[PDB]
């Protein structure tokens, strides 16, 4: 199968910036590569076909180059509507394959997250499940690492994360992480902590509560 590797996975740039996206084919695909723009919740829109030919109606700031195995998309001057995820697609042989996508971000200054932790309610504790929630509020860039520890033991496989779309006013993200347990397990441990790693933090931030004092 023709493997498509798109790089980078994410790019943060300011309005007006030049952005370059690469697409590498595992095998020779001559010039039969297309580029697409997908805004959130919308259908993909054709931007570029035959590696370098501009589709009608697409602004001239978009350009494609490359051949064989190596291809490049360039937005010479980023404009607010060009924030989207961009996909390359090969049309040389079946199966048709897409790259992994590149989400293009809006640049702002680095912002550290405010971190909060929420124990489960007593109501929940009557149903037999416990949800502990770690909230990351208003941060940039999106990359942050959240680790859950219950009495300093690393949890794995029992948490889920959700990230907001970018805020239209201040360009930050928020993250909700929900760790799910049985009631019995929640009553058998004391210290619950969410540990946060983020580019904007000089050291890990840990927020915790003691169950027996709640």
């Amino acid at each position: 199968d023709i493997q498509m590797t798109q790089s980078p996975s994410s790019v943060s740039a300011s309005v007006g910036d030049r952005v370059t996206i690469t697409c590498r084919a595992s095998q020779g695909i001559s010039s039969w590569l297309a580029w697409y723009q997908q805004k959130p919740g919308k259908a993909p829109k054709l931007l570029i076909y035959a590696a370098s030919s501009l589709q009608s109606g697409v602004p001239s700031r978009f350009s494609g180059s490359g051949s064989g195995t190596d291809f490049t998309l360039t937005i010479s001057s980023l404009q607010p509507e060009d924030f989207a995820t961009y996909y390359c697609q090969q049309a040389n042989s079946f199966p048709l394959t897409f790259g992994g996508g590149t989400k293009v971000d809006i640049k702002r200054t680095v912002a550290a997250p405010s971190v909060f932790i929420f124990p489960p309610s007593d109501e929940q504790l009557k149903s037999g499940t416990a949800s502990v929630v770690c909230l990351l509020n208003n941060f940039y860039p999106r990359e942050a690492k959240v680790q859950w520890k219950v009495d300093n033991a690393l949890q794995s496989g029992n948490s889920q994360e959700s990230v907001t779309e970018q805020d239209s006013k201040d360009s930050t993200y928020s993250l909700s992480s929900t760790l799910t347990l049985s009631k019995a397990d929640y009553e058998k441990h004391k210290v619950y902590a969410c540990e946060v790693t983020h580019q904007g933090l000089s050291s890990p931030v840990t927020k915790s509560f003691n169950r027996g004092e709640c």
Binding site: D1, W32, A34, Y36, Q38, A43, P44, K45, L46, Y49, A50, Q55, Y87, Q89, Q90, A91, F94, P95, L96, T97, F98, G99, G100, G101, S114, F116, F118, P119, P120, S121, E123, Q124, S127, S131, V133, L135, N137, Q160, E161, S162, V163, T164, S174, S176, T178, T180, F209, N210, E213, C214
Partner: protein, 221 residues
């Protein structure tokens, strides 16, 4: 104007079948090849199948060969996809697309969501996400509501009957191992307000006719 209008998506039981339609208008459908492409939650695009303008040649991705069936009715100008033996991983938005020459796709349909899941409509339980009583006033306090165990979307959350709009984040729902959805809606407020002001999330789940007002008053921890 070239238009693709999709229909037929929805909830299907595991092992079941569903038929998707893509009605084409504004161009000669019989002169163009067509494709189905799908998109899993939070994932990229994945190609499923293609058919030539006459219908004589069909092509399938390896993950789907033998299980789904692409067809077209050139007399009604509608493309189709009969989907059999469904699995949870086939849950996706499906797009129909025109091969406009050299493998470029123009136009795309709007997409239609197929959810392959074994579940009934359930109204959500709403639980407070409460800070503790020990918050330094002047700081920023977070509070919220955990909206747990519902199907289908959407739930709408407003705060204080629409009066509180600043600093609200309603997070995208996550699908649990149980097959039910969960999301959190949170708001940050000055910590000094926790003793004098009430914070109530208004949750509306229209498919199950569930309306819940839940207050995230805190607890002494």
């Amino acid at each position: 104007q070239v238009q693709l209008v999709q229909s037929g998506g929805g909830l299907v039981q595991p092992g079941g079948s569903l038929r998707l339609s893509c009605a084409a208008s504004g161009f000669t459908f019989s002169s163009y090849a067509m494709s189905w492409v799908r998109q899993a939650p939070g994932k990229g695009l994945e190609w499923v199948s293609a058919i030539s303008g006459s219908g004589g040649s069909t092509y399938y991705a390896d993950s789907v060969k033998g299980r789904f069936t692409i067809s077209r009715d050139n007399s009604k100008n509608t493309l189709y996809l009969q989907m059999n033996s469904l699995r949870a991983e086939d849950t996706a938005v499906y797009y129909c697309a025109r091969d406009s020459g050299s493998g470029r796709f123009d136009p795309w349909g709007q997409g239609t969501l197929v959810t392959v899941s074994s579940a009934s409509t359930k109204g959500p339980s709403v639980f407070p996400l409460a800070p503790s009583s020990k918050s330094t006033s002047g700081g920023t306090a977070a509070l919220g509501c955990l909206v747990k165990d519902y199907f289908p979307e959407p739930v709408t959350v407003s705060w204080n009957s629409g009066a509180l709009t600043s600093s609200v984040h309603t997070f995208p729902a996550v699908l649990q191992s149980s097959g039910l959805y969960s999301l959190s809606s949170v708001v940050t407020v000055p910590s000094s307000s926790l003793g004098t002001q009430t914070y109530i999330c208004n949750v509306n789940h229209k498919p199950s006719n569930t309306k819940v007002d839940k207050k995230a008053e805190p607890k002494s921890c």
